[PDB]
Amino acid sequence: CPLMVKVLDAVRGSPAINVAVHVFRKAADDTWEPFASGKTSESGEPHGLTTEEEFVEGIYKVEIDTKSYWKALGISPFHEHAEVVFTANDSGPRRYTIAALLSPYSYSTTAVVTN
Amino acid sequence: CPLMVKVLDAVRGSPAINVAVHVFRKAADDTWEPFASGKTSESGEPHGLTTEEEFVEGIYKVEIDTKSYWKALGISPFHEHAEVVFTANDSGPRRYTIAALLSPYSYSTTAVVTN
Amino acid sequence: CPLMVKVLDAVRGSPAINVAVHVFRKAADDTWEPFASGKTSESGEPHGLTTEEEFVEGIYKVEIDTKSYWKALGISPFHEHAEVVFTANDSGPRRYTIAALLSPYSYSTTAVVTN
Amino acid sequence: CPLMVKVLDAVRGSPAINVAVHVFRKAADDTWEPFASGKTSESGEPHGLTTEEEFVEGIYKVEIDTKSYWKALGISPFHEHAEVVFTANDSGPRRYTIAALLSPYSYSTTAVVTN
Ligand SMILES: O=C(O)c1ccc2nc(-c3cc(Cl)cc(Cl)c3)oc2c1
């Protein structure tokens, strides 16, 4: 998978399961077009978001529906969602993992980009 | 100030200075309307974003221009910006401090809500 | 204050109040000597840890008692404490702000060094 | 592996490779006894730290030699190392992953505890 998303829960100390993940790509007219989506599994990942042929250079947005996740756990959250906006750049072979660590009033995100 | 933003640089160990901060508020037609903007000072904060009378209930987005910040420092970062989307003043007026900690391939955000 | 500590709670969206902070300084015999201690106030900071004259060059450890904090809130957390070990004043006197953001199964720490 | 350590680099956007990881267990006399150690691989993990028979309940310390890692990259770091101190508790089957995300002036750590 050229693009992987991993969601972790800082309160329970576990992968964040059943979280909706939406991916968008910026079109030529500067609007967000739905690209891929899924629900995280027991591993905190929504497996199989895209393919190497589809995941071309461009500007992408990964939206994680954190509010629904915290509401399901009964914890009052601050954010409506967590969004990660980045440019995908070909510079030799690349694999992107967008990882997010969630708390009710905070989130962290990092990118792990490997050859 | 009912809405404060503090931006920190995890590489240099300093406030992130001269960073552009843009705030939007969601309109009834579900579009994002410009609400306020500023530039961080030597303390990593843009002083005087809004007022008590203007900062009404709503869904707000704070966009911190991290890409321009890292580029000005000679680093090609991963993210286009650090975003923070939240509902404000839904249980009465509060003071919100949005803090962001920046690295070239990661960022964290947290909210401190007082009153 | 040459050494400031700010503790934030990522679950409640507030400063972490009544948290014990212990500071040690490494002695010539490679053992940790007690240096200062305090309790965070309503702003999440223990006011007046040390002075310019006492805060000499050395290797310091700031231990934040996160386990007692979470237990007092009814949470059984993962960590015993949040630690921060650093060399201070090696390139002349500086002001250090050690910030920690806490969750039951995670914590982050950052330093802001000024002067 | 009942105990796994994963180290990520927030500056390069990759696993932190060739990082020394030291694990200690608190003995009955309240001193830190070396338990296991290794160097992170290309995946950011020092594979095979312990076994299920050896990894009993107790207080453990995971020390990550961050300073040597940043010095090898030529970046001035703040911390002498990153330390994670926690209690291992049997409450049905458990597998512990200690993850750390590194920056020169900041580190984050989380625990992912699975059945
Ligand atoms: O020194 C102050 O006044 C001050 C204020 C707000 C602050 N927010 C942080 C913070 C944010 C994140 Cl997302 C992660 C971590 Cl470790 C720290 O540090 C602050 C310090």
Ligand SMILES: O=C(O)c1ccc2nc(-c3cc(Cl)cc(Cl)c3)oc2c1
């Ligand atoms: O054990 C694994 O496979 C695995 C993978 C990706 C991971 N990303 C993290 C992580 C992310 C953020 Cl944004 C902050 C922190 Cl403290 C940690 O931990 C991971 C563990």
